Write an enzyme that holds these catalytic residues in place. Structure first.
Site, mmCIF file in Angstrom:
data_model
loop_
_atom_site.group_PDB
_atom_site.id
_atom_site.type_symbol
_atom_site.label_atom_id
_atom_site.label_comp_id
_atom_site.label_asym_id
_atom_site.label_seq_id
_atom_site.Cartn_x
_atom_site.Cartn_y
_atom_site.Cartn_z
ATOM 1 N N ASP A 18 -3.059 -6.406 -6.614
ATOM 2 C CA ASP A 18 -4.401 -6.106 -6.143
ATOM 3 C C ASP A 18 -4.783 -7.113 -5.066
ATOM 4 O O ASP A 18 -5.002 -8.293 -5.339
ATOM 5 C CB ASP A 18 -5.425 -6.063 -7.279
ATOM 6 C CG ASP A 18 -6.728 -5.396 -6.856
ATOM 7 O OD1 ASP A 18 -7.151 -5.591 -5.692
ATOM 8 O OD2 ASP A 18 -7.330 -4.674 -7.678
ATOM 9 N N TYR A 68 -7.594 2.927 12.913
ATOM 10 C CA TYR A 68 -8.075 4.219 13.388
ATOM 11 C C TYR A 68 -9.110 3.997 14.505
ATOM 12 O O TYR A 68 -9.787 2.975 14.543
ATOM 13 C CB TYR A 68 -8.665 5.017 12.218
ATOM 14 C CG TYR A 68 -9.254 6.348 12.611
ATOM 15 C CD1 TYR A 68 -8.482 7.299 13.256
ATOM 16 C CD2 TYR A 68 -10.591 6.650 12.340
ATOM 17 C CE1 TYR A 68 -9.008 8.516 13.634
ATOM 18 C CE2 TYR A 68 -11.134 7.875 12.722
ATOM 19 C CZ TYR A 68 -10.325 8.801 13.368
ATOM 20 O OH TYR A 68 -10.828 10.019 13.750
ATOM 21 N N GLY A 78 0.781 -1.226 0.000
ATOM 22 C CA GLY A 78 0.000 0.000 0.000
ATOM 23 C C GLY A 78 0.817 1.281 0.000
ATOM 24 O O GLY A 78 0.665 2.126 0.876
ATOM 25 N N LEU A 125 -2.274 -0.818 9.988
ATOM 26 C CA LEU A 125 -2.667 0.516 10.431
ATOM 27 C C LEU A 125 -4.165 0.578 10.652
ATOM 28 O O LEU A 125 -4.941 0.012 9.880
ATOM 29 C CB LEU A 125 -2.228 1.573 9.413
ATOM 30 C CG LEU A 125 -0.721 1.574 9.178
ATOM 31 C CD1 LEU A 125 -0.366 2.606 8.134
ATOM 32 C CD2 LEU A 125 0.048 1.813 10.474
ATOM 33 N N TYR A 137 -17.182 8.278 9.213
ATOM 34 C CA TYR A 137 -16.294 7.191 8.826
ATOM 35 C C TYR A 137 -17.196 6.103 8.257
ATOM 36 O O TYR A 137 -17.421 5.072 8.883
ATOM 37 C CB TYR A 137 -15.521 6.670 10.033
ATOM 38 C CG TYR A 137 -14.265 5.881 9.715
ATOM 39 C CD1 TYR A 137 -13.243 6.436 8.952
ATOM 40 C CD2 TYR A 137 -14.081 4.603 10.223
ATOM 41 C CE1 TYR A 137 -12.078 5.718 8.688
ATOM 42 C CE2 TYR A 137 -12.926 3.885 9.975
ATOM 43 C CZ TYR A 137 -11.931 4.444 9.195
ATOM 44 O OH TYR A 137 -10.783 3.725 8.947
#
Ligand SMILES: NC(=O)C1=CN([C@@H]2O[C@H](COP(=O)(O)OP(=O)(O)OC[C@H]3O[C@@H](n4cnc5c(N)ncnc54)[C@H](O)[C@@H]3O)[C@@H](O)[C@H]2O)C=CC1
Ligand SMILES: NC(=O)C1=CN([C@@H]2O[C@H](COP(=O)(O)OP(=O)(O)OC[C@H]3O[C@@H](n4cnc5c(N)ncnc54)[C@H](O)[C@@H]3O)[C@@H](O)[C@H]2O)C=CC1
Ligand SMILES: NC(=O)C1=CN([C@@H]2O[C@H](COP(=O)(O)OP(=O)(O)OC[C@H]3O[C@@H](n4cnc5c(N)ncnc54)[C@H](O)[C@@H]3O)[C@@H](O)[C@H]2O)C=CC1
Ligand SMILES: NC(=O)C1=CN([C@@H]2O[C@H](COP(=O)(O)OP(=O)(O)OC[C@H]3O[C@@H](n4cnc5c(N)ncnc54)[C@H](O)[C@@H]3O)[C@@H](O)[C@H]2O)C=CC1
Ligand SMILES: Cc1c(CN(C)C(=O)CCc2cnc3c(c2)CCC(=O)N3)oc2ccccc12
Ligand SMILES: Cc1c(CN(C)C(=O)CCc2cnc3c(c2)CCC(=O)N3)oc2ccccc12
Ligand SMILES: Cc1c(CN(C)C(=O)CCc2cnc3c(c2)CCC(=O)N3)oc2ccccc12
Ligand SMILES: Cc1c(CN(C)C(=O)CCc2cnc3c(c2)CCC(=O)N3)oc2ccccc12
Lengths: 295, 295, 295, 295
Positions: free
Chosen positions: D79, D178, D15, D176, D188
């Site tokens: 992908d 949030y 990414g 990662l 969100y």
């Protein structure tokens, strides 16, 4: 007196396939509180469930404290994997359990409920599946993982999204989760951990959204182990029951009606200030910081 | 019907000083359920509380659903800072409002309850104080911090330790907390954050210890802001009420009876499988990950 | 290259009693990173520690990777139960360990540090005690519980409040906690659970208060079991070590320097965005949802 | 000296699409520590990215502290929606940007890396997407929600499942996340809350699974807001950045290298006892119990 009073209220319970799961237990307690019960039963077992009920096979489990029998106003065949008929694959359409039924997608069931009852008051989600629960997450396929999430998590969003516009004031929802959502429990495979984490996360987000959109409350109950259809199928539910008895603050085994009583309270006007909550009904096992070997 | 039935049960509520706090709200709902109520009232305000009650000052707040008025079987002057008379500082012994009273330490109150009633069924802890709440934790003194813990946290342990041996089967406890326990809330000073962290940590430990020793359940309710005695003294409670309305999934302001209804359920047989729990009754504010400006 | 570079930084480490605990491990790793080390050692074992250090008894434990010895610029007798000499009971003053010494209160230590070193950059809190850890919380006295809180939790507030005004830019703190703070662990008695809950709550609050007042960061590390002096003194630390090996995602036993490495990183400029954190260094045991038997 | 030493270690970063995201920051810091850097780049932007790189468009963001430039040993078109070529749908197969490339499914990419490099040491997952992020969860479609989980959550499992068997001793992973994973953040949308909830739950489960199977450690970092590619498309990232500055214990804005430094530490031998962790690197915003609107 202080009553949990659900008289005249209409509850839709998604996920009752027999008298041995939490869905039945919730139905029974909502009925005790005076609610009218509608049932969503998964298509491939709809015939057998409905037949067994009519043939009196569940009568031992239908006894209510007022002398009457638990009764469902309507039982809807449903597959909450599918929102509209367009979503249904040919494999499902040509399945003999599905081909003889119709109107079982979420949008369709909701339209039927609207036609016949106009509104609902209580939405209960008591359904889950992964096709790969016996597999470690490392060994779980993409399709399996996404199937666990589709059936066990998004199904809730679909039910609330469709039912929401026909909920009355003071309406609320209940879903069922398990502590493996945010703590590692080896054996809870096939992406079921992710499905419960998603269900719990969505409970909070939906509490806000549904709260602001319709004034609807959204809560989830985290339950201890139960020898239900799903439970028994994992293969070791009895070991889990025994482990929880040695582990927990209190030694009593789960009973579906314990979760049912908590659900009744949560959807009642006595809980108008409770929303987005995850309520543990597991005899306190979840608060423990160590296993029974170090006691 | 589904009732929360506490008829014949005895509840001791520690911390009712007027009709404006959560303790009063809890008393009222337990009484609605049929419970007999014993009250512990802080020594310096015991005379005015008892006298105002008898003058009819709280009569508007006393009305019950059955037409009866909320009634206390006994009000005990109490200071939960003290376990035994040997704990009381000379200054307190010389104080006007203490010196013409006796039997107000925790051990002495429990002994009087045991003599006249034999047993209790429910223990409610609705009391907190820090002498330094306006001070940032960084500027709070050792004396102030430990006083906050002594009054707000350890008092619960002393009440359960002393009452536990006379609790009946099916007994349970309720204490009150606030989300600043484990999230930083500037302004919740004088060590109140630590006192609440300790209370919630103690809730889990005592659920195991009291569960295994006496079969007693131990739960805590985390409530939204209320303009009680303690609430009004902090100096900005109305702003906090307004904030919560803008912030939470649901906009209704807190009412003492909402926490009362939760308590009534938690102490009833309907909640036999619930222990060690922190139940949020705050209209869902606690689940939000951001404040109102970013909505 | 990517260095954790603490060159020229002055660290004060409160709680080094020998070479077997986390304090020593943290000291070694800060020393590797280039830090100057100041030590606070509990009064009763201060002479013993100093004399062992001088006779070369810890020399095997002092070897740094660069070929040099872990060296303390100054070791201060300390008792973090006391902020000022006025707080010390005469009963303590007359104890032989305390009578032979002077200037060991928090204020006095900070004044000596300011006088001879001017400022500090890192504050490490690696100390705890409860006089009643062998007691169930239910059986723990008010005096015992408050003493645990005073020694194990308030001591951190006192050290940060006194040292804060002499901290340089980029300063940060480390304290040590255990998972029993907010999950129930039978055997962690004497109110140690409350003391760690308080410590973790204060970490969050002080991160905000000290962050805004001095730009200081405030972090805590939750560690796995270690056979330190305190560890060994509980009487069953070896069984806890073995249990963790069967339980955790990774089987390796704790080493003091694992925590030390985490401390070194958190106090380095590489962690400028990390504050208020509870960092688990326990081989992942804390993330498990069940214990070993149900694997 | 105390070095975060990744010399000779091979890292694969999933990414990186430009120099403005967390992926780039992580690459830079692992490179500073000595790691060799392999990159997985999303097929539709693989050509633009690789061309921009050799054209020198990112040279300002490539400068290292040793005076060298950040160098990717191999860049792989990828992908992560697809595990094997069998998984690829028709529209994608014939699409201009895929139809000439080959070997871009997770299995094929791992096979190439295995041929080229034999083994890897570090796996970084820095990728997420929902096609419906602007939509309330209530209005999010099943296809959108499952696409968010597929791309943002299952992709990590696929990468670990395939990479695991060729991971060296001491290997580890970073992802990662949030804070909206388990706290409601309106906006969100598109199921991203559920995607992150799953990612975090999977982190715990996989830490046990990968830990026992290969001795691999698994950790996630929860970051504050960043003006990245994904960050800017959201449409209010600058408001989020400002909010966090007003809200957090410390005011500094996020820099990509802050997460990168935390990542380098966590994958280094200095963190051998850290696994299953969610490390917050957000200036402490996550520990706050109310918003800036009060204070
Ligand atoms: N049984 C246990 O130990 C525990 C169960 N839970 C949760 O309780 C809930 C109910 O499970 P149980 O009562 O134990 O088992 P259950 O098997 O009786 O109920 C689950 C139901 O989901 C239905 N279902 C499966 N796929 C469906 C679909 N695509 N569309 C509509 N219905 C579908 C099944 O027909 C089944 O009746 C589940 O969410 C479960 O995860 C939670 C905690 C503990
Ligand atoms: N008021 C609010 O916004 C909220 C309060 N809580 C908690 O609710 C509980 C009850 O508080 P409130 O109803 O608001 O206020 P309150 O002032 O009406 O009740 C506190 C009681 O504690 C008593 N008390 C104080 N020191 C005592 C001592 N040394 N010995 C015996 N009693 C003592 C007081 O006299 C008073 O009756 C407290 O634990 C509080 O922390 C929780 C959440 C929100
Ligand atoms: N040892 C273990 O398994 C684990 C320990 N911790 C925590 O790590 C920290 C350090 O403990 P350890 O290194 O294991 O043992 P340790 O015994 O070597 O360190 C504790 C120190 O506290 C000092 N101390 C006690 N009362 C003091 C006072 N009134 N004033 C100044 N110092 C006092 C003692 O002299 C002792 O050196 C403690 O906070 C402990 O709770 C955390 C997790 C696990
Ligand atoms: N940017 C922010 O404010 C914050 C981002 N995070 C997380 O950081 C991670 C990285 O995000 P950013 O650096 O901000 O954005 P980014 O856009 O620079 O990186 C996300 C990458 O995912 C790639 N991607 C999307 N679909 C893909 C697929 N099917 N196959 C392979 N790659 C695909 C994109 O091309 C992009 O390069 C994400 O997990 C994000 O959720 C977390 C916290 C804050
Ligand atoms: C409790 C408990 C449960 C019950 N529980 C909370 C569940 O959510 C069960 C869910 C479930 C989902 N999918 C399937 C099955 C069960 C069996 C049949 C099948 O085809 N698929 O499962 C465990 C697995 C490991 C450890 C404990 C538990
Ligand atoms: C809500 C809320 C409260 C109410 N709450 C949960 C409390 O726990 C209040 C506790 C309290 C403890 N000690 C004292 C006082 C109040 C005022 C009178 C006295 O002299 N000392 O306090 C806040 C402080 C800051 C922000 C929110 C709140
Ligand atoms: C780990 C672990 C510990 C170690 N740990 C984290 C601790 O924090 C130990 C703290 C401690 C505090 N006070 C005293 C003692 C130890 C023994 C000597 C004495 O006089 N008082 O204790 C446990 C108790 C039960 C279960 C695990 C653990
Ligand atoms: C921070 C933060 C973020 C950044 N963050 C943590 C993210 O994870 C962003 C992820 C993301 C997922 N899907 C898409 C996009 C971004 C933009 C382009 C698109 O096609 N879909 O998003 C928010 C949304 C609302 C509130 C805060 C935030």
């Amino acid at each position: 007196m202080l009553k949990i009073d659900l008289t005249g209220k209409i509850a839709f319970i998604a996920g009752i396939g027999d008298d041995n799961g939490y869905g039945w237990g919730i139905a029974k307690m909502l009925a005790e509180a005076g609610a009218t019960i509608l049932v969503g039963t998964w298509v491939p077992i709809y015939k057998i469930f409905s037949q067994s009920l009519e043939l009196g096979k569940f009568n031992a489990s239908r006894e209510l404290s007022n002398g009457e029998l638990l009764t469902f106003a309507k039982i809807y065949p449903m597959d909450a994997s599918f929102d509209t008929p367009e979503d249904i694959p040919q494999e499902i359409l040509e399945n003999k359990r599905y081909k003889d039924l119709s109107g079982y997608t979420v949008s369709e069931v909701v339209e039927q409920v609207k036609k016949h009852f106009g509104h609902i008051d209580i939405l209960v989600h008591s359904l889950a599946n992964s096709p790969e629960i016996a597999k470690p997450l490392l060994d779980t396929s993409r399709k399996g993982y996404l199937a666990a999430l589709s059936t066990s998590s998004y199904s809730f969003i679909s039910l609330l999204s469709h039912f929401g516009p026909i909920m009355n004031a003071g309406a609320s929802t209940i879903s069922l989760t398990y502590l493996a959502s945010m703590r590692a429990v080896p054996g809870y495979g096939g992406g079921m951990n992710a499905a419960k984490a998603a269900l719990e996360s969505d409970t909070k987000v939906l509490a806000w959204e549904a709260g602001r959109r319709w004034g609807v409350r959204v809560n989830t109950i985290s339950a201890g182990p139960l020898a239900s259809r799903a439970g028994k199928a994992i293969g070791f539910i009895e070991r889990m029951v025994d482990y929880y008895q040695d582990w927990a603050p209190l030694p009593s085994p789960m009973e579906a009606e314990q979760v049912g009583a908590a659900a009744a309270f949560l959807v009642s006007p006595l809980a108008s200030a409770i929303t987005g909550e995850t309520l543990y009904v597991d005899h306190g096992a979840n608060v423990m910081g160590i296993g029974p070997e170090m006691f």
